Amino acid sequence: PIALTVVPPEEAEPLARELVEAGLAAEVLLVPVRRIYREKGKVREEEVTLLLILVSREGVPALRAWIEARHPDDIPLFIVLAVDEEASNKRYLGYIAAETHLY
Amino acid sequence: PIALTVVPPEEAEPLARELVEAGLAAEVLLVPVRRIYREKGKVREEEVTLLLILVSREGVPALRAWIEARHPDDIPLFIVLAVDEEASNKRYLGYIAAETHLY
Amino acid sequence: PIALTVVPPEEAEPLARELVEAGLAAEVLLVPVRRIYREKGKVREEEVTLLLILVSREGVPALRAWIEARHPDDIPLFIVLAVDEEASNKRYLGYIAAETHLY
Amino acid sequence: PIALTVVPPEEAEPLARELVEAGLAAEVLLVPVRRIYREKGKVREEEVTLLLILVSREGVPALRAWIEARHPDDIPLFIVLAVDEEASNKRYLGYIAAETHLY
Amino acid sequence: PIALTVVPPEEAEPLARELVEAGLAAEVLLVPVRRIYREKGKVREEEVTLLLILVSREGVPALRAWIEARHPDDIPLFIVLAVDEEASNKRYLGYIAAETHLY
Amino acid sequence: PIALTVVPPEEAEPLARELVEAGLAAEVLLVPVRRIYREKGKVREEEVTLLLILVSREGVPALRAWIEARHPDDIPLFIVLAVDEEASNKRYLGYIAAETHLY
Amino acid sequence: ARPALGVLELKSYALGVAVADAALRAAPVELLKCEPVEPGKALIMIRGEPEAVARAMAAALETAKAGSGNLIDHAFIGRIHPALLPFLLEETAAPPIEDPDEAVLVVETKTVAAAIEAADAALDVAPVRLLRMRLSEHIGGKAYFVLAGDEEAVRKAARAVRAVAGEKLIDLRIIPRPHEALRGRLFF
Amino acid sequence: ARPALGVLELKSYALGVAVADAALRAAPVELLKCEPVEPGKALIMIRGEPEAVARAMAAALETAKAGSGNLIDHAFIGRIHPALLPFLLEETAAPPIEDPDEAVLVVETKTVAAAIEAADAALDVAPVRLLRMRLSEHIGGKAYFVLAGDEEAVRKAARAVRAVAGEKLIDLRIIPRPHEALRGRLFF
Amino acid sequence: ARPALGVLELKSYALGVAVADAALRAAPVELLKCEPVEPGKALIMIRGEPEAVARAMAAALETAKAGSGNLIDHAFIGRIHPALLPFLLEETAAPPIEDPDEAVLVVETKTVAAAIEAADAALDVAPVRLLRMRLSEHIGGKAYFVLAGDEEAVRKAARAVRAVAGEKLIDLRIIPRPHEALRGRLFF
Amino acid sequence: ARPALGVLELKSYALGVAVADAALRAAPVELLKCEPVEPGKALIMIRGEPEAVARAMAAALETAKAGSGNLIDHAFIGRIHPALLPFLLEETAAPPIEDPDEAVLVVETKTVAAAIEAADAALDVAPVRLLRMRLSEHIGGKAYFVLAGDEEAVRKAARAVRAVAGEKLIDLRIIPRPHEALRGRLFF
């Protein structure tokens, strides 16, 4: 599946590199987005980075535990998107499963 | 779930702020994308903004009705992505449901 | 559904235009992302373009075959996202199905 | 079964005799009761006669039709009581069925 | 349940007292009614007493056998009325069951 | 249905009128009966009044609660008779249901 | 103004013609209806004097035993309400809006006989008015009617309707204050 | 000594708190019990005057209709026996062994309401004594009580108990002469 | 004040002891709970640093695969709310009635893990207070808790609770103004 | 130190009192237990001389035939192990940790009789120690015990336990080296 998290722009690459080199994710894509949210009843506006994490179905529980045990903010963003595996490239799904070292 | 809409770059933040401050969405992320589409049988090319809207399962019908009753173009883009709730952060899903004021 | 592929930044628009003008996809959105991946056991870092392709459920097999029969790299990225059709704009889903010429 | 109707005291015996001699009921018992009912929102009080009619299960539809096609008041009282036939005298139930001439 | 029998007015209280003091019935109510019946094809008219006997579901077979083994007339009246026990006073139903000595 | 209670002859009409004018019963019929019961192991004999109460199936629980919360004796008589509604006058059953004010 | 009425519903139109002939031969009544209705039933209606109509209804019920299970419903009213007759005779006019503050009660039943019985009972009990009455006309075999009156009167009549209709009731709704746009269509 | 009592059992503790609040608001009663019991029920008990308790019970039954099928049992006694109160108030003492020749009757029911009703009826009818009364306390949701008296009195009360309890009775046993070792535990 | 917490529920106490041993060996955590609970489950709770607790939870989940289908629920919170700890440590006091106008929300779930997760989410989102928290103690295996606050705050927290609990929610009720007699038992 | 023991389990407490009375009347035994246990059973225990206890068990089994299918389990041991008695008499102390290198065996069964039989067999066969023994106390009706000893001795006793318990065994686990934090709770 694909997991989405939002981090401040400064700690994007350090977190992504440390996530891949530790074998918790096969691949990470980084997108600079612009975030609009409600803080203390007032609409705020901040610049963040959106992380698209490519992980296997078995490495998801380790990834979620690793994320919220280290995420800065009080309520971490962690959304998992359902992937339609029958219409996807099956050889890439094998690449994702093999590069997600269970350890 | 996550809803995707495309708007011209000028009316992105006004629509996003008005969508959040009215309680129709807990959170909005804005991405500047580049759009390739077919108009009158010819391939065109325009710059737009992609909106990623975080809303609860109960606020979706109000959001869709609010969008196409106010969307500029003739056929509005409104796609809802299925979210795998069992592997996602459940405390964020509660935050999404609570910040989507039913009104 | 929505299909995601990653291509080098130079061949993004040529591939997107050729994909739309051939009737294999109704619409393509292009996002410049930053890619972190493992090559030969070392964490690398490259700039690519993410393609969000809007195609109907019937044009997916033709799109996948067209992609990996022409994709440069050895293992092409091709992920199909499940779209919740009951909460989406149904008139846009009809637009997607009609503009995906079966040929 | 047993059917209960209420009639003014003067027309009790004429109705009962005419009901039995016509074969619509095997037996009738007459009880002088005292009736308390609401008329025009005020509690009234009148003397009537309560009729306990012993009829078979087949003569009930003829008895009900005969009663409300001739009953004086606008809404006739006609209540049928369920009789537990397995614990009752079966030879009397045969007497009731035989003396209720179908005609 | 409630059992109904009809006896001549003279032997009403002797039968009722002997029925209660022998433990065959918990309670008896006596009503003077007026009876209209067909004898030899002619409508007759006599004064009798109606007995309402309160007995338990277990004492019914003993009561019926006791009645028609001693009833004067050729075909005794013995009708058992079904009682809706769920809407009735349950503490009285216990009183009825306890005062009906099985013996 | 029809509910049967027994009260001393003096408080018959006051209870009946207060029961009807309060909307707890559509109709009440009063019969002077003669009661034979066992008190302290001895057969006694008293004159009472039998109340036949016409109430709807929805007003029964309110009627039973109203009766035993105000009945003089230690164990009140309250028996509900099952009424065969398919063979009864249906327009009277509607009158019974409408005149039993739920309140 | 207040004659007797008898209603029969059958699954077959062929048996309906046989039943109607037997009823007409038995007693001097007037045939108000003999036609096929949705969803493939037969409806028979007669009127006259209470004793004649009772005689005809007995004879008609005898003939219906030939068709095993062909009888759906039946009813017999000894004295119909004066307000029922214009809707049964099909010659009626839209009642005026005598009071905009009146509430409405909408009732729908499975059979025609249940609807006529429930309407007659409700009209006799509570002080209400009959606005509309439709008897199995291209609505999938159901029947419905609309009553108007005060709020207390309408809820009293709802109690009577629920008791009479029994298990043949489909739905029952009370609308306390209809809108102006709705009031035009309802009062028709 | 002899006030009125009302009992309600519900499948949910959340609906139990809602029901208890409605009952308390309706009439001036005293709340004797509102707690979860085995195997996941809620028990509510009130006391007061017969008219006030009847008013509260009606209001509580109205609220329980929100939970579709959430009501398990209910009861209302207009005048409780004096011997019942010490066991309901939880402040009681072990009755003495006034007669070693007494027989015992052991009764167990599915619900608390059935047990209280059957015990009150049996105590009012036959000359017996209440020795023990346990109300759904770590016994799998059942309730039980023990009565003592002569042999004839105990069998008379068994007839009353069987009638009142109905289909909620689990078992009923009469022991004509308990042993000395058993008599210690039973009389507790 | 805000450490990490990990919860596991298993069908067997024997496998519970095996799972607890594996978790303790993997990382330096503190065992808060290892006991059998109703209706025949096992409950394990640990606390410590987020990385150590995550390591222990991974090891414990590996051992639970020996029992085919023996895992009922599990949860892991990286930073518990300060208000949760006194109820988990079992050393707590009855909160005062700071405002009689507060509404209450009563929530009951099937599992202990769902209750702790839903309570933590609700406390983090809306401005509410935790009054009571009972974890599978002679109530048939269910768990429940009570929250207090304004009406708007309580309905906001009800939305969060419904989302987090999911299909493990049994019932949820909001009482706008508890009675004085009820307020004593609820605030305990 | 080593008397005879007899155990009976029944679905009804009323029949339990009847069965206990018959057993006490038949032979001069001592009643160790007669009480309702989870999830709604009855447990009876007696002790004495082997011939007297056998006589009482025969008489009790005769009475249980009145309840069709009411007997759940039974057992009779001619000479109980000395280590079993302190746990059955309820007056016991926590055994010391004589060897930290001992392994533990955790066994849980459906019935009390199966647990006592399996424990007695295991203690007689292998050189092990009994640390804990809980008999159907708010754990959903199950029973469990813990044995301690060497690794070879514990696996020998596991073989005996599996044979004796049969189809009434729920789970069986051997933990080779318990952690220090676990060892405190297990040795209790």
CSV table of C-alpha atoms in Angstrom, one decimal, chain J:
chain,number,residue,atom,x,y,z
J,1,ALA,CA,-2.6,-35.7,55.2
J,2,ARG,CA,-3.7,-38.1,52.5
J,3,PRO,CA,-7.5,-38.7,52.8
J,4,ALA,CA,-10.0,-39.5,50.0
J,5,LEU,CA,-11.6,-36.8,47.9
J,6,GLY,CA,-14.8,-36.6,45.8
J,7,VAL,CA,-15.9,-33.9,43.4
J,8,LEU,CA,-19.2,-33.3,41.6
J,9,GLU,CA,-20.3,-30.6,39.2
J,10,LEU,CA,-23.9,-29.9,38.4
J,11,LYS,CA,-25.7,-27.3,36.3
J,12,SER,CA,-28.2,-26.4,39.0
J,13,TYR,CA,-27.7,-25.2,42.5
J,14,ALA,CA,-31.1,-26.5,43.6
J,15,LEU,CA,-30.1,-30.0,42.5
J,16,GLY,CA,-26.7,-29.4,44.1
J,17,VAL,CA,-28.3,-29.0,47.5
J,18,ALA,CA,-30.3,-32.2,47.0
J,19,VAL,CA,-27.2,-34.1,45.9
J,20,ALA,CA,-25.2,-32.8,48.8
J,21,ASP,CA,-27.9,-33.9,51.3
J,22,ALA,CA,-28.0,-37.4,49.9
J,23,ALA,CA,-24.2,-37.7,50.0
J,24,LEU,CA,-24.1,-36.6,53.6
J,25,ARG,CA,-26.8,-39.0,54.7
J,26,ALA,CA,-25.2,-42.0,53.1
J,27,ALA,CA,-21.8,-42.0,54.8
J,28,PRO,CA,-19.9,-40.1,57.6
J,29,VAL,CA,-18.0,-37.6,55.4
J,30,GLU,CA,-17.0,-34.0,55.7
J,31,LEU,CA,-18.5,-31.4,53.4
J,32,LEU,CA,-15.7,-29.2,52.0
J,33,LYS,CA,-17.7,-27.2,49.4
J,34,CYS,CA,-21.2,-26.6,48.3
J,35,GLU,CA,-21.6,-23.3,46.5
J,36,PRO,CA,-22.5,-21.8,43.0
J,37,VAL,CA,-19.5,-21.0,40.8
J,38,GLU,CA,-19.1,-19.5,37.4
J,39,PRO,CA,-20.7,-19.6,34.9
J,40,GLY,CA,-23.7,-20.9,36.8
J,41,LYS,CA,-22.6,-24.3,38.1
J,42,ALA,CA,-22.5,-26.0,41.5
J,43,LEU,CA,-19.4,-27.5,43.1
J,44,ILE,CA,-19.5,-30.1,45.8
J,45,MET,CA,-16.4,-31.5,47.6
J,46,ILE,CA,-16.2,-34.1,50.4
J,47,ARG,CA,-13.4,-35.9,52.2
J,48,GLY,CA,-12.9,-38.7,54.7
J,49,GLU,CA,-12.0,-42.4,54.5
J,50,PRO,CA,-11.8,-44.1,51.1
J,51,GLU,CA,-14.7,-46.5,51.8
J,52,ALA,CA,-17.0,-43.8,53.2
J,53,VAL,CA,-16.2,-41.4,50.4
J,54,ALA,CA,-16.9,-44.1,47.8
J,55,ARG,CA,-20.2,-44.8,49.5
J,56,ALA,CA,-21.2,-41.2,49.5
J,57,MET,CA,-20.2,-40.7,45.8
J,58,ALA,CA,-22.4,-43.6,44.8
J,59,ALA,CA,-25.4,-42.2,46.6
J,60,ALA,CA,-24.8,-38.7,45.2
J,61,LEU,CA,-24.6,-40.1,41.6
J,62,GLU,CA,-28.0,-41.8,42.2
J,63,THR,CA,-29.7,-38.5,43.0
J,64,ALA,CA,-28.1,-36.7,40.0
J,65,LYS,CA,-30.1,-38.9,37.6
J,66,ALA,CA,-33.2,-36.9,38.5
J,67,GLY,CA,-31.7,-34.0,36.6
J,68,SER,CA,-31.5,-35.2,32.9
J,69,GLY,CA,-28.1,-34.2,31.7
J,70,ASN,CA,-27.4,-32.1,34.8
J,71,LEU,CA,-24.1,-33.8,35.6
J,72,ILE,CA,-21.0,-32.1,34.1
J,73,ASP,CA,-18.1,-33.9,35.7
J,74,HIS,CA,-17.1,-36.0,38.7
J,75,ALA,CA,-14.0,-37.6,40.1
J,76,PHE,CA,-12.9,-39.7,43.1
J,77,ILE,CA,-9.3,-40.0,44.4
J,78,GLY,CA,-8.5,-42.7,46.9
J,79,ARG,CA,-5.5,-40.9,48.4
J,80,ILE,CA,-4.9,-37.2,47.6
J,81,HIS,CA,-1.3,-35.9,47.4
J,82,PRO,CA,-0.1,-34.0,50.5
J,83,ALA,CA,0.6,-30.9,48.3
J,84,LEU,CA,-3.0,-30.7,47.0
J,85,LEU,CA,-4.7,-30.2,50.4
J,86,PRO,CA,-3.5,-26.7,51.3
J,87,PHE,CA,-4.9,-25.3,48.1
J,88,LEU,CA,-8.2,-27.1,48.5
J,89,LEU,CA,-8.6,-26.0,52.1
J,90,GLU,CA,-8.0,-22.4,51.0
J,91,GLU,CA,-5.5,-21.8,53.8
J,92,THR,CA,-2.2,-21.7,52.0
J,93,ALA,CA,1.0,-19.5,51.7
J,94,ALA,CA,3.0,-18.5,48.7
J,95,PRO,CA,5.8,-21.1,48.1
J,96,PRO,CA,9.3,-19.7,48.1
J,97,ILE,CA,11.5,-19.4,45.0
J,98,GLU,CA,13.8,-22.3,45.9
J,99,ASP,CA,15.4,-22.3,42.4
J,100,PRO,CA,15.4,-19.4,39.9
J,101,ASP,CA,16.4,-21.9,37.1
J,102,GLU,CA,13.1,-23.9,37.4
J,103,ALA,CA,10.8,-24.0,34.5
J,104,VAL,CA,7.0,-23.5,34.8
J,105,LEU,CA,4.1,-25.3,33.3
J,106,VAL,CA,0.7,-23.5,33.0
J,107,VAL,CA,-2.4,-25.7,32.5
J,108,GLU,CA,-6.0,-24.7,32.1
J,109,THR,CA,-9.0,-27.0,31.9
J,110,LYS,CA,-12.8,-26.7,31.4
J,111,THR,CA,-13.8,-28.4,34.7
J,112,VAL,CA,-12.6,-28.4,38.3
J,113,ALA,CA,-12.6,-32.2,38.5
J,114,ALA,CA,-10.3,-32.5,35.5
J,115,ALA,CA,-7.9,-30.0,37.0
J,116,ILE,CA,-7.7,-31.8,40.4
J,117,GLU,CA,-7.2,-35.2,38.7
J,118,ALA,CA,-4.5,-34.0,36.3
J,119,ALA,CA,-2.6,-32.2,39.1
J,120,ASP,CA,-2.7,-35.2,41.4
J,121,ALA,CA,-1.4,-37.5,38.5
J,122,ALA,CA,1.3,-35.1,37.6
J,123,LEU,CA,2.5,-34.6,41.2
J,124,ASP,CA,2.6,-38.4,41.7
J,125,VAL,CA,4.6,-39.1,38.5
J,126,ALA,CA,7.2,-36.4,38.0
J,127,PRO,CA,9.3,-34.5,40.7
J,128,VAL,CA,7.5,-31.2,40.4
J,129,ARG,CA,6.0,-28.6,42.7
J,130,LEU,CA,2.6,-26.9,42.8
J,131,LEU,CA,2.8,-23.1,42.9
J,132,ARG,CA,-0.8,-22.0,42.2
J,133,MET,CA,-4.2,-23.6,41.9
J,134,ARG,CA,-7.4,-21.6,41.1
J,135,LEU,CA,-10.8,-23.3,40.9
J,136,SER,CA,-13.4,-21.5,38.8
J,137,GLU,CA,-13.2,-18.0,40.4
J,138,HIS,CA,-14.4,-15.2,38.1
J,139,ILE,CA,-12.4,-16.5,35.1
J,140,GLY,CA,-15.4,-17.6,33.0
J,141,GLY,CA,-15.7,-21.1,34.6
J,142,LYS,CA,-12.2,-22.4,33.7
J,143,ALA,CA,-9.7,-23.6,36.2
J,144,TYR,CA,-5.9,-23.5,36.1
J,145,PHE,CA,-2.8,-24.4,38.0
J,146,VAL,CA,1.0,-23.9,37.7
J,147,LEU,CA,3.8,-26.5,38.3
J,148,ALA,CA,7.5,-25.8,38.8
J,149,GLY,CA,10.6,-28.0,38.3
J,150,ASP,CA,13.4,-28.9,36.0
J,151,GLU,CA,12.9,-28.9,32.2
J,152,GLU,CA,12.9,-32.7,31.9
J,153,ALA,CA,10.6,-33.1,34.9
J,154,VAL,CA,8.2,-30.5,33.6
J,155,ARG,CA,7.9,-32.1,30.1
J,156,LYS,CA,7.3,-35.5,31.7
J,157,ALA,CA,4.5,-34.0,33.8
J,158,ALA,CA,3.1,-32.4,30.6
J,159,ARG,CA,2.7,-35.9,29.1
J,160,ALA,CA,0.8,-37.1,32.2
J,161,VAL,CA,-1.4,-34.0,32.2
J,162,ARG,CA,-2.3,-34.3,28.6
J,163,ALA,CA,-3.3,-38.0,29.0
J,164,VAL,CA,-5.4,-37.5,32.2
J,165,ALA,CA,-7.2,-34.3,31.1
J,166,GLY,CA,-8.2,-35.6,27.7
J,167,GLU,CA,-10.7,-33.5,25.8
J,168,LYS,CA,-11.2,-31.1,28.8
J,169,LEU,CA,-7.8,-29.5,28.3
J,170,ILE,CA,-7.9,-25.9,27.0
J,171,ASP,CA,-4.2,-25.1,26.7
J,172,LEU,CA,-0.8,-26.1,28.0
J,173,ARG,CA,2.4,-24.1,27.9
J,174,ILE,CA,5.9,-24.6,29.1
J,175,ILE,CA,8.1,-21.5,29.8
J,176,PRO,CA,11.8,-22.5,30.1
J,177,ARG,CA,13.1,-19.5,32.1
J,178,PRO,CA,10.5,-17.0,33.4
J,179,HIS,CA,11.6,-13.3,33.7
J,180,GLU,CA,12.1,-11.7,37.0
J,181,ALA,CA,9.1,-9.5,36.7
J,182,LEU,CA,6.9,-12.5,35.7
J,183,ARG,CA,8.4,-14.7,38.4
J,184,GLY,CA,6.8,-12.6,41.2
J,185,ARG,CA,3.2,-13.0,39.9
J,186,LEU,CA,3.6,-16.7,38.9
J,187,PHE,CA,5.1,-17.9,42.2
J,188,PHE,CA,2.1,-16.4,44.1
